[PDB]
C-alpha cells in the first residue's frame, strides 16, 4: 500500500468457518478456465475451445498465541472434521461456501513452545440436487 494512512483492520475481513472465529495469517486463491488447445500437423495455425470454468481453491494459515493455545487449537480441529460443507468468510474474497480438504498442525516443545500453526486447504463446494438433473 501507498501512503501512510492505511489501516489493515479496516480492509481485511475477520476470518471464520461454520461460525467459529479464528485468527487468519495468510490468504491465497486459485482461479482459471479449462481450455482445449490443439495444434494441427504440418500446419502453421493452431486452435482453441473454451470448455467451462475451473473449480476454485483457497488456502489459509492460522496462528494461536493467546494463553492456553492448545485448548483452542485442539477444539478448532473438531470443527474442520465436522461432516459437510459450511460458510467460510475468506479475509479478502468475502463469504463463500467451502469444504476442508486437509490440515497440517505444526507444534514443538523446545524449538517453539507457546504458539501453534495450522495450514488449511479449502475447496469451493456448491450444493447440488440429488436427482442428477
Amino acid at each position: 500500500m501507498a501512503g501512510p494512512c492505511y489501516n489493515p483492520n479496516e480492509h481485511y475481513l475477520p476470518a471464520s468457518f461454520k461460525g467459529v472465529p479464528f485468527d487468519a495469517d495468510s490468504s491465497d486463491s486459485e482461479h482459471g478456465r479449462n481450455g482445449a488447445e490443439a495444434e494441427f500437423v504440418f500446419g502453421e495455425r493452431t486452435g482453441y475451445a473454451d470448455l467451462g470454468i475451473k473449480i476454485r481453491s483457497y488456502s489459509i494459515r492460522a496462528r494461536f498465541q493467546t494463553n492456553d493455545h492448545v485448548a483452542l487449537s485442539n477444539a478448532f480441529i473438531a470443527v474442520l472434521e465436522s461432516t459437510g460443507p459450511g460458510l467460510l468468510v475468506h479475509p479478502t474474497r468475502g463469504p463463500v461456501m467451502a469444504a476442508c480438504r486437509s490440515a497440517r498442525v505444526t507444534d514443538s516443545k523446545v524449538d517453539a513452545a507457546g504458539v501453534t500453526y495450522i495450514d488449511i486447504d479449502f475447496v469451493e463446494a456448491n450444493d447440488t440436487v440429488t436427482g442428477f438433473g
Partner: protein, 133 residues
Amino acid sequence: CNKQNGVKNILITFTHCDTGEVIGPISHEQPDDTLPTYKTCAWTNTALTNGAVMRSASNATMTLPVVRDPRVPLAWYQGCAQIDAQVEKFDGTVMTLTEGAVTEPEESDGRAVTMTIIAAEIDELLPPGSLAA
C-alpha cells in the same frame, strides 16, 4: 529545569511465574551514562516501488539498562519473571509498561543488567500543554 535530558525515577515490579509472588515497585538506578530507548508505533513500513509501503505487525519494545538490586535474584531480571516498568524523565514525560517480557537475555557480570522488553503497547504522558488528543 526542563531542558535537561535525563532519567529521574525508575520503578519495576516483578511477578514470579512459578510461585505468583509479587514485589512492590522498587526504585532503581542506572549503571552508566546511557539512556533507555523507546518504540511505540506498533506497525512497520517497508519500502515498495514508486513511494508505496507495506505494513507488518511488529511490537513495541523498551531497552532498560538498570543496576541490579542486591535483594532480588539475578534470574528475575532475565527471562524468568514478568516485568512492569515506569520511567520518569526530568522534563516531565512518563512512559508506562505492563505485562512485558524479556527476550534473548545475555550474560551479565552481576551488577549491570540490560533488559529488552516487549509489550502490546506503551503509554506516554506528555508534559502539560500537549497538542494531540
